[PDB]
Amino acid sequence: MNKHSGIDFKQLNFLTKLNENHSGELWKGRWQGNDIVVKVLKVRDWSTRKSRDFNEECPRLRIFSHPNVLPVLGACQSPPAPHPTLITHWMPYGSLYNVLHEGTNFVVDQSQAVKFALDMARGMAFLHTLEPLIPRHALNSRSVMIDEDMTARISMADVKFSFQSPGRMYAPAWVAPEALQKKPEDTNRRSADMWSFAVLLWELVTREVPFADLSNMEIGMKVALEGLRPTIPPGISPHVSKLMKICMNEDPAKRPKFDMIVPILEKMQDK
Amino acid sequence: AFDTLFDHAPDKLNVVKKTLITFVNKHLNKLNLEVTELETQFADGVYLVLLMGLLEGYFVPLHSFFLTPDSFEQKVLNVSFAFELMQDGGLEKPKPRPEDIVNCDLKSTLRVLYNLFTKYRNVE
Numbered sequence: 023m024n025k026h027s028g029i030d031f032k033q034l035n036f037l038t039k040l041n042e043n044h045s046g047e048l049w050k051g052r053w054q055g056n057d058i059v060v061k062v063l064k065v066r067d068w069s070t071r072k073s074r075d076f077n078e079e080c081p082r083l084r085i086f087s088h089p090n091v092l093p094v095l096g097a098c099q100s101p102p103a104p105h106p107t108l109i110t111h112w113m114p115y116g117s118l119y120n121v122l123h124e125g126t127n128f129v130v131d132q133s134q135a136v137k138f139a140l141d142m143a144r145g146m147a148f149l150h151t152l153e154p155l156i157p158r159h160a161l162n163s164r165s166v167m168i169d170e171d172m173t174a175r176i177s178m179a180d181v182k183f184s185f186q187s188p189g190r191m192y193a194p195a196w197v198a199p200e201a202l203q204k205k206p207e208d209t210n211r212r213s214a215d216m217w218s219f220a221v222l223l224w225e226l227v228t229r230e231v232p233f234a235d236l237s238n239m240e241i242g243m244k245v246a247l248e249g250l251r252p253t254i255p256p257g258i259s260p261h262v263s264k265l266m267k268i269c270m271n272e273d274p275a276k277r278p279k280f281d282m283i284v285p286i287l288e289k290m291q292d293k
Numbered sequence: 294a295f296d297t298l299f300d301h302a303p304d305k306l307n308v309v310k311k312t313l314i315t316f317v318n319k320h321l322n323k324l325n326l327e328v329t330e331l332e333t334q335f336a337d338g339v340y341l342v343l344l345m346g347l348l349e350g351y352f353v354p355l356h357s358f359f360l361t362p363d364s365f366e367q368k369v370l371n372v373s374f375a376f377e378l379m380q381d382g383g384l385e386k387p388k389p390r391p392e393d394i395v396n397c398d399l400k401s402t403l404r405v406l407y408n409l410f411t412k413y414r415n416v417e
């Protein structure tokens with residue numbers, strides 16, 4: 023018999039639909055006393071092979087051992103569920119993107135922003151110790167969630183499954199130039215993640231969406247082929263300027279590791 | 294249906310072609326690309342791939358297709374990949390074979406472009 027049955031789809035209480043797009047639907051719900059979010063995945067040409075792969079790839083995402091990583095609580099196997107489905111806890115503030123750019127009630131201060139940066143760096147350092155790496159679509163402000171005590175957490179629900187279309191990139195502004203152009207097996211994926219963190223630093227400094235005026239296709243082609251880069255923000259400390267520049271080094275090999283920037287960010291805390 | 298617009302109204306065929314030319318430039322000009330000729334400028338598959346990302350809001354990683362195809366076979370692969378992107382976005386499997394586009398069949402080309410126009414004419 024199988025090692026895991028996964029979560030029983032019949033035990034999910036679907037409360038309210040949150041959104042729908044190309045990749046599927048997000049719902050707020052309840053399961054075994056937990057407030058959850060459910061992703062119902064939309065997959066063209068679903069097959070036994072893809073279902074087998076989904077079920078092999080989901081257990082890796084159930085990471086309960088680090089405060090700055092948000093696990094997949096579990097997944098519904100399809101069959102017998104109607105559709106392949108992922109479950110996480112509901113994070114009350116939503117994504118870092120929501121908190122920074124759609125924050126109608128208060129503006130997070132820069133002490134909180136530095137704490138977000140440290141949280142994300144700690145979670146990424148931990149994920150980078152895993153062997154092999156867990157494939158993700160990308161680190162960006164939509165794949166980081168903000169929990170009830172404002173802890174930032176890297177969402178494992180951003181997993182990239184072996185069947186999902188590598189040809190469509192929806193947040194290229196956070197992607198390293200080499201990763202816009204080369205297959206992942208031909209890049210250092212850890213160094214590519216550091217570029218993404220550099221763009222997150224830029225986002226925390228400017229409180230702007232990177233390249234907001236451009237479409238995703240414009241961003242990817244201009245960053246890859248025309249050298250488009252975020253402009254270094256004026257009026258910031260030389261220390262923050264220097265950190266942003268080293269994390270955004272054009273040479274992937276010269277970018278620091280996450281475990282090197284954690285102590286730098288620790289020192290930038292108020293405590 | 295579309296076949297009456299092609300053969301037996303050649304000034305409406307010219308109006309459909311002028312319509313499609315305006316539409317594809319609305320998007321491809323954002324990459325500093327200009328289309329003047331529907332007979333050949335989509336045959337190698339590159340502009341169809343770039344167009345799909347402009348219309349459906351994604352970047353296509355350059356390792357996923359041949360940005361500068363160097364053979365008939367790579368052009369066919371680009372057009373096949375673009376057809377997959379179209380189906381990803383909801384369109385039915387396109388009628389022409391990918392080779393029909395690479396071989397500059399004007400009818401095969403305008404059918405594909407017209408279906409993109411039917412769907413995405415209001416994308417900004």
Ligand SMILES: COc1cc(Nc2c(C#N)cnc3cc(OCCCN4CCN(C)CC4)c(OC)cc23)c(Cl)cc1Cl
Binds near residue numbers: 040059061110115167
């Ligand atoms: C389950 O799987 C996945 C889940 C997610 N996404 C979410 C995860 C996760 N992870 C966690 N918690 C989430 C909470 C959400 O809403 C919280 C309320 C936000 N408001 C924003 C505006 N401010 C002013 C008030 C608060 C949310 O809303 C859509 C999505 C969440 C993704 Cl993106 C992908 C997959 Cl595969």
